[PDB]
Design a protein around this nucleic acid. Structure first.
Ligand SMILES: CC[C@H]1CN2CCc3cc(OC)c(OC)cc3[C@@H]2C[C@@H]1C[C@H]1NCCc2cc(O)c(OC)cc21
Ligand SMILES: [Mg+2]
Ligand SMILES: [Mg+2]
Ligand SMILES: [Mg+2]
Ligand SMILES: [Mg+2]
Ligand SMILES: [Mg+2]
Ligand SMILES: [Mg+2]
Ligand SMILES: [Mg+2]
Ligand SMILES: [Mg+2]
Ligand SMILES: [Mg+2]
Ligand SMILES: [Mg+2]
Ligand SMILES: [Mg+2]
Ligand SMILES: [Mg+2]
Ligand SMILES: [Mg+2]
Ligand SMILES: [Mg+2]
Ligand SMILES: [Mg+2]
Ligand SMILES: [Mg+2]
Ligand SMILES: [Mg+2]
Ligand SMILES: [Mg+2]
Ligand SMILES: [Mg+2]
Ligand SMILES: [Mg+2]
Ligand SMILES: [Mg+2]
Ligand SMILES: [Mg+2]
Ligand SMILES: [Mg+2]
Ligand SMILES: [Mg+2]
Ligand SMILES: [Mg+2]
Ligand SMILES: [Mg+2]
Ligand SMILES: [Mg+2]
Ligand SMILES: [Mg+2]
Ligand SMILES: [Mg+2]
Ligand SMILES: [Mg+2]
Ligand SMILES: [Mg+2]
Ligand SMILES: [Mg+2]
Ligand SMILES: [Mg+2]
Ligand SMILES: [Mg+2]
Ligand SMILES: [Mg+2]
Ligand SMILES: [Mg+2]
Ligand SMILES: [Mg+2]
Ligand SMILES: [Mg+2]
Ligand SMILES: [Mg+2]
Ligand SMILES: [Mg+2]
Ligand SMILES: [Mg+2]
Ligand SMILES: [Mg+2]
Ligand SMILES: [Mg+2]
Ligand SMILES: [Mg+2]
Ligand SMILES: [Mg+2]
Ligand SMILES: [Mg+2]
Ligand SMILES: [Mg+2]
Ligand SMILES: [Mg+2]
Ligand SMILES: [Mg+2]
Ligand SMILES: [Mg+2]
Ligand SMILES: [Mg+2]
Ligand SMILES: [Mg+2]
Ligand SMILES: [Mg+2]
Ligand SMILES: [Mg+2]
Ligand SMILES: [Mg+2]
Ligand SMILES: [Mg+2]
Ligand SMILES: [Mg+2]
Ligand SMILES: [Mg+2]
Ligand SMILES: [Mg+2]
Ligand SMILES: [Mg+2]
Ligand SMILES: [Mg+2]
Ligand SMILES: [Mg+2]
Ligand SMILES: [Mg+2]
Ligand SMILES: [Mg+2]
Ligand SMILES: [Mg+2]
Ligand SMILES: [Mg+2]
Ligand SMILES: [Mg+2]
Ligand SMILES: [Mg+2]
Ligand SMILES: [Mg+2]
Ligand SMILES: [Mg+2]
Ligand SMILES: [Mg+2]
Ligand SMILES: [Mg+2]
Ligand SMILES: [Mg+2]
Ligand SMILES: [Mg+2]
Ligand SMILES: [Mg+2]
Ligand SMILES: [Mg+2]
Ligand SMILES: [Mg+2]
Ligand SMILES: [Mg+2]
Ligand SMILES: [Mg+2]
Ligand SMILES: [Mg+2]
Ligand SMILES: [Mg+2]
Ligand SMILES: [Mg+2]
Ligand SMILES: [Mg+2]
Ligand SMILES: [Mg+2]
Ligand SMILES: [Mg+2]
Ligand SMILES: [Mg+2]
Ligand SMILES: [Mg+2]
Ligand SMILES: [Mg+2]
Ligand SMILES: [Mg+2]
Ligand SMILES: [Mg+2]
Ligand SMILES: [Mg+2]
Ligand SMILES: [Mg+2]
Ligand SMILES: [Mg+2]
Ligand SMILES: [Mg+2]
Ligand SMILES: [Mg+2]
Ligand SMILES: [Mg+2]
Ligand SMILES: [Zn+2]
Lengths: 249, 91
RNA sequence: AAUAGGGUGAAGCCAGAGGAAACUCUGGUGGAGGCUCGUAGCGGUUCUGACGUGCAAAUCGAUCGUCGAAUUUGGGUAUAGG
RNA sequence: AGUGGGGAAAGGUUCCAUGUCAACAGCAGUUGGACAUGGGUUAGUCGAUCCUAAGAGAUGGGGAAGCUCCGUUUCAACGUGCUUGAUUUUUCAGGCCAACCAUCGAAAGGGAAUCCGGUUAAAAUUCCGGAACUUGGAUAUGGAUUCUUCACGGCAACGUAACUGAAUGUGGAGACGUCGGCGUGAGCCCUGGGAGGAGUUAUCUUUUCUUCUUAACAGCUUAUCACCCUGGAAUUGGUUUAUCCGGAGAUGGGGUCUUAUGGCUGGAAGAGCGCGGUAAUUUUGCCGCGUCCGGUGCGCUUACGACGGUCCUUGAAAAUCCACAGGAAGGAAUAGUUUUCAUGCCAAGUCGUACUCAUAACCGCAGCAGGUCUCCAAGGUUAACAGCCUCUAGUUGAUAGAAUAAUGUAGAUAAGGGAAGUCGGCAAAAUAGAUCCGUAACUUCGGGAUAAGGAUUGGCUCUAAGGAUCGGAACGAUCAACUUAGAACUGGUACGGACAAGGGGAAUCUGACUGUCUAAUUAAAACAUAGCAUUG
RNA sequence: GGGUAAACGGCGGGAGUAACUAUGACUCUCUUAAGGUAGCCAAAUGCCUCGUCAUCUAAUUAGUGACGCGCAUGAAUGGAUUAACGAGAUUCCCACUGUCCCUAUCUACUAUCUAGCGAAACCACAGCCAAGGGAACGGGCUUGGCAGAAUCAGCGGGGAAAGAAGACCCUGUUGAGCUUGACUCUAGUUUGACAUUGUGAAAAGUUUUUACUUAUUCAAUGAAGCGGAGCUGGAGGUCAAACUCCACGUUCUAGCAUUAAGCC
RNA sequence: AUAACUGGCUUGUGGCAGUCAAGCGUUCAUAGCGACAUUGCUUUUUGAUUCUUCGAUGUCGGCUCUUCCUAUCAUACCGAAGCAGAAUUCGGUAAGCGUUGGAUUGUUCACCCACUAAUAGGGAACGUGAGCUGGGUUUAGACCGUCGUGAGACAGGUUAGUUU
RNA sequence: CUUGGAUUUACUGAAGACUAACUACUGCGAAAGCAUUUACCAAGGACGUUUUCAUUAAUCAAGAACGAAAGUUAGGGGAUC
């Protein structure tokens, strides 16, 4: 047969992300002395649309502690953040929406966003519109914090890891139907080349494992082993169960 | 006169896409095209730019909000939760 | 970079009429839409027309689809034979 | 929306003149994009050149037997650094910085600066004449400024001929989608008077056609928006075609700004244009007169403006230029400073530039009915940039002559019947514009719908309605656009008179829809799609 | 061993009956599970088949509506509907007509004839029939009919006319595309051991756990503030003497912070 | 060297025709029929075979047009009857002359409606595609049902498919 | 379901519900209904009044608000039944 569309994506020729119009990488500040020991104050200059992103971004200006200079940061805007708002980041920062605090400095039940998986990676968790991380609890003896991720998973992170207080702005986006192929066209026109999708069952056996037949049908179980190889993993990979989800999980 | 009985702003879609999808669109699109009261200057001059961006024509304040409303219920709940935990922490 | 001229007439807005209220009716205004008739354009339905040692190794004629967007297109650039 | 006038790609001398006909131009040939000989492309201002885009790709490194692969600042000791006071001691003294930063990548993106008239056989935003401009350099004079050292005025928005400002920093310009109506301008279209020229003239026609123009650049002036001062608003007012604004200060009164755009003047009438009278084998002319003053708009095209709509879509970068913050350093009195004020001096290299851009200069073996990106765009009819006729411009090219059998190809018509033809109404016919009337089932309430189904439409002569600017007025004066409605008359009952231009209805199967593919036998019920669900 | 069908898929054979006739509402047993539910249908899916009934017509293997033990319908291998849309397939009606009865006439361009110009396909030799025999359908052979130069416009009976070493079929120890529980392997991946690989403790009988950091691995930064201690306060109730803990310059505001003042 | 047309041999089968005469026919074998048997013809059926053609003879049907056969449906003239007439049936010479318009189906075949003197049957490479048409079949697209783990199969249905 | 340690036992935690006992011929509300604490928000009946207005009222076709449980649509939760 032929190399399938799953496998053609890794080469990344026509499958790279369309990034001309993007407004920069959304990151927290580099963890420095001011954030480790006290707090630093910045001012929100802009709240802008980032193409390919549902969440707006905030452009926040900070002073450089060591040279006469201004540092502009690209944060993910939490909902309620406004232009001209003062943002405080550090260990001694107060519990206000938009402030960047270590996870250990936030009491249980604190809603936080753009949370660091590891100390100083500048944000990994809860970055999409309407999403957040709930702080479940602390283990001060081991310097660890238990959090709940948007997927429902519980994670243990260093208490020195940082997050931004509040919920990511732009939520409820999925509530509206797209209603049109053109709307999805414009949605992925500034994301990447993954739309539209031809069904593999509608191809020929060269093109896909589902192709061929005198009727369109998969023919074998569409649940595929985790240990299958590239060119085989088309369908439901390592599926623990299938069918309509009935009852609680 | 009243021009449409029920489609309203969704009368631009004609007969396409299904009635359930069109009334579901109508609910959120009246909200995304409405004018909201500015919490800064007090005028009802706040309109959406892109999703999550709500600008006031008068005082030129931009606030991060929801996709189709200035404030979501989840954000209001988080605002009160944070206010409460701040009060307890600072006594 | 390109896309005559019409039709329909969505929100919003103004006025009048009715109602106890919750609210309703009428006339304008407005100018929405992967809306519509229809040029350029893009396409290529039918005649199973012409031609079929052709004007042409795919064209010609009428008829036809679509025609403001998932539109059409120049140039630059990327992807290379299991 | 050209058979007109230019260009991009591509060609490469096909351009122009002279000669010329063996071959080629599927007839001919005295002609030619053919053949032969010569000639021809002039730039500081137009491009390239420079910037960065998607991307391409060295270096340090790391792979790989290796050809080479990765990577683009990456685990790198990465400046052929600058700025000054100099020194003439051709030595120096230092002061700052070195996040990023090899390089290539656009004749449609970004970007310093030129126009008019004339001139050739063939070149011209390139030559000639005149008139400007930019950048770089040099540099003096005038002005400006200083004894209160680095200017004044205005309440203010801010103004000006100038009117210190290092390191470093902050900003702005470069720099940005699309659509809708409105407004303004320009060019074009239309039109009145006058001064010329041509045409018609049996008759009519103060007539029909035509000339009456003004570049870049300089000065003054000119604007929506925005802003400032005054003032303090419900009896809420102002206000757009479009309902937005005002105690976060409206209406009213007075101002400030951008100069987009127009006006006046200089450029500039000396040019060009239109006439009349003359010179001459004659290179080329010489003389005189005129070239003036208006009006109009749902007009067309285009530019700009203030607005409004739209997106789970929010619509490049960099070179480069400026301003501001900061306060280093240096500055006067018998004199000091500055080339962001005026004037003056010098220079601007390299390569491209002819011509075609297509029913004969390109690609399809060719002078091939195919293909190949884009700019400008007159009158009439009309909704119309459609169709039809015409002006400017350009062509009149395509082997021809004589006849007019059959069978064709393209096109017409047909008594009575009206799908009996045929697999099948295939093909053709019928309908068709506009105004008014009337419009069913079903429906996701949006539609269906131009459903279905009817009436009218010419020409002429009238009538009515619909506005602007002035004057202190429910009125007068002047001026003005085509829309709509009604009536009479009229004719071989014709009249969307050519052109242009839906046939309709009742149902079943199927795909929801718009969209997409088998270039060159299949456009579909196939693919996609929104929606739904599952998996990691 | 368990779970999972909006995973691939599957959803059947058997055994009796109502005061005319007809029908059968009326129970268990097997296949590796369940045994086709709601719906829909001679449907683009029904063999029999032009199914049967009704309607449409003068007449209908067509159409529509019904029926349903359905060869072999059926639920995201989606079922049933469905307004709108469709150069999709189909039936009927009105209008319309040369589609037809059944043809006729007209126009231009051909064809035609001339001057000039001037190919190609094809060609064993060639070119009148009838019968015979024959590789079983002759232009030629045999036997007959016959048979007279040179030709023009048409034409499509024949030349088993031309175009192509049949594309169907079979054979070949000839392939190729595709597939799978074929034969034989394989990139990848997973699992163990050895090496990289060192320093301790404890416990199990060599194995398990956790301590160290320098090997190795991951990440960031223009390698900016690390580790320990000490200055200053706030505290514990101080029972010797100040030990332990905490902090140690920035939070109404869209301003500013750069090239050290000061002291010795 | 070998199948899927035509053609050739064969004629089981299909079709058509005789001979005998048990019975039928009020009686009566033979007007008209005719069992049990038996002899043939035909090549308008389908088989059997594999001779020709696989360096290709264009494979359904219809439309169009000509011709031929006769085993005569009609028309001419006649013989026979269980022929009174009328109608009908059996038969002879006879192919001179005609043998239709439509609904459904791609159909050949079929089946109805209707007219008619009658609506006979066949052949000509199952006449006839450089005559047409292209509805069917039988390339490649697509759908369904059953079958297959699958790629795929179906001589099942369905829709679209260059005729030099 | 269980020698793979079930059931049981102590400690700890997480989820959703629900508010026992007190709880009654007791309370509140137009009805449906309402039961852990506290705060906030706006209501309400009765009572008291030598306050105020003076017929403003009663019941009501039309027309409205609320309306147990179950059920429907879409998110979230899904302990127990
Ligand atoms: C002289 C020109 C006429 C002469 N006449 C005579 C009468 C007649 C009658 C017809 O039917 C009554 C007819 O049927 C069509 C054609 C004619 C011819 C047609 C021809 C022009 C026509 N030639 C062929 C195609 C064509 C294409 C064009 O672009 C085009 O534009 C100029 C024109 C054409
Ligand atoms: Mg999808
Ligand atoms: Mg898909
Ligand atoms: Mg396919
Ligand atoms: Mg495969
Ligand atoms: Mg598989
Ligand atoms: Mg398959
Ligand atoms: Mg298929
Ligand atoms: Mg399918
Ligand atoms: Mg299967
Ligand atoms: Mg449950
Ligand atoms: Mg459209
Ligand atoms: Mg359309
Ligand atoms: Mg065509
Ligand atoms: Mg054809
Ligand atoms: Mg021909
Ligand atoms: Mg392109
Ligand atoms: Mg035109
Ligand atoms: Mg041109
Ligand atoms: Mg020439
Ligand atoms: Mg010639
Ligand atoms: Mg010659
Ligand atoms: Mg030459
Ligand atoms: Mg230039
Ligand atoms: Mg790049
Ligand atoms: Mg490289
Ligand atoms: Mg190297
Ligand atoms: Mg470059
Ligand atoms: Mg350029
Ligand atoms: Mg740009
Ligand atoms: Mg010039
Ligand atoms: Mg020239
Ligand atoms: Mg000059
Ligand atoms: Mg506009
Ligand atoms: Mg104008
Ligand atoms: Mg200029
Ligand atoms: Mg002048
Ligand atoms: Mg906009
Ligand atoms: Mg030129
Ligand atoms: Mg050409
Ligand atoms: Mg001609
Ligand atoms: Mg007729
Ligand atoms: Mg007639
Ligand atoms: Mg009729
Ligand atoms: Mg018919
Ligand atoms: Mg018929
Ligand atoms: Mg017929
Ligand atoms: Mg038929
Ligand atoms: Mg037609
Ligand atoms: Mg009508
Ligand atoms: Mg479709
Ligand atoms: Mg094709
Ligand atoms: Mg192909
Ligand atoms: Mg086609
Ligand atoms: Mg069943
Ligand atoms: Mg059933
Ligand atoms: Mg059935
Ligand atoms: Mg049924
Ligand atoms: Mg059927
Ligand atoms: Mg039938
Ligand atoms: Mg019919
Ligand atoms: Mg039926
Ligand atoms: Mg089934
Ligand atoms: Mg199925
Ligand atoms: Mg379509
Ligand atoms: Mg031969
Ligand atoms: Mg013969
Ligand atoms: Mg023979
Ligand atoms: Mg021969
Ligand atoms: Mg002989
Ligand atoms: Mg012929
Ligand atoms: Mg022939
Ligand atoms: Mg062969
Ligand atoms: Mg062998
Ligand atoms: Mg292959
Ligand atoms: Mg026989
Ligand atoms: Mg027989
Ligand atoms: Mg044979
Ligand atoms: Mg053969
Ligand atoms: Mg042949
Ligand atoms: Mg032949
Ligand atoms: Mg006979
Ligand atoms: Mg007879
Ligand atoms: Mg035949
Ligand atoms: Mg033939
Ligand atoms: Mg043929
Ligand atoms: Mg045929
Ligand atoms: Mg096919
Ligand atoms: Mg087709
Ligand atoms: Mg078909
Ligand atoms: Mg076909
Ligand atoms: Mg309780
Ligand atoms: Mg109580
Ligand atoms: Mg009550
Ligand atoms: Mg009452
Ligand atoms: Mg009531
Ligand atoms: Mg739910
Ligand atoms: Zn505001």
């Amino acid at each position: 047969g032929r190399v399938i569309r799953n496998q053609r994506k890794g080469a990344g020729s026509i499958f790279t992300s369309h990034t001309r119009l993007r407004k920069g990488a959304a990151k927290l500040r580099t963890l420095d002395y001011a954030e480790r020991h006290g707090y630093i104050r910045g001012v929100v200059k802009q709240i802008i649309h980032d193409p390919g992103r549902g969440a707006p971004l905030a452009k926040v200006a900070f002073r450089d502690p060591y040279k006469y200079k201004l540092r502009e940061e690209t944060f993910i805007a939490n909902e309620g953040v406004y232009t001209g708002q003062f943002i405080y980041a550090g260990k001694k920062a107060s519990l206000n929406v938009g402030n960047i605090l270590p996870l250990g400095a936030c009491p249980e039940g604190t809603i936080v966003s753009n949370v660091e998986e590891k100390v100083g990676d500048r944000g990994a968790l809860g970055r999409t519109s309407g999403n957040y991380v709930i702080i479940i609890g602390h283990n001060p003896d081991e310097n660890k914090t238990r959090v709940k991720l948007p997927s429902g998973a519980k994670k243990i992170i260093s208490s020195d890891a940082r997050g931004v207080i509040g919920v990511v702005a732009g939520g409820g986006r999925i509530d509206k139907p797209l209603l049109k192929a053109g709307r999805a066209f414009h949605k992925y026109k500034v994301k990447r080349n993954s739309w539209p999708k031809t069904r593999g069952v509608a191809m020929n056996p060269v093109d896909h494992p589902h192709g061929g037949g005198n009727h369109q049908h998969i023919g074998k179980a569409s649940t595929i082993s985790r240990g299958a190889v590239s060119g085989q993993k088309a369908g439901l990979i390592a599926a623990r169960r299938t069918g309509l989800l009935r009852g609680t999980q | 006169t009243k021009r449409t009985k029920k489609v309203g702003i969704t009368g631009k879609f004609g007969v396409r896409y299904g009635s359930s999808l069109r009334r579901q669109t109508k609910k959120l699109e009246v909200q995304q095209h409405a004018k909201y009261d500015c919490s800064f200057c007090g005028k009802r001059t706040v309109q959406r730019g892109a999703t999550g961006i709500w600008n006031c024509k008068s005082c030129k304040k931009t606030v991060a909000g929801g996709a189709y409303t200035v404030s979501t219920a989840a954000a209001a709940t988080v605002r009160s939760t944070i206010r409460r935990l701040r009060e307890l922490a600072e006594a």
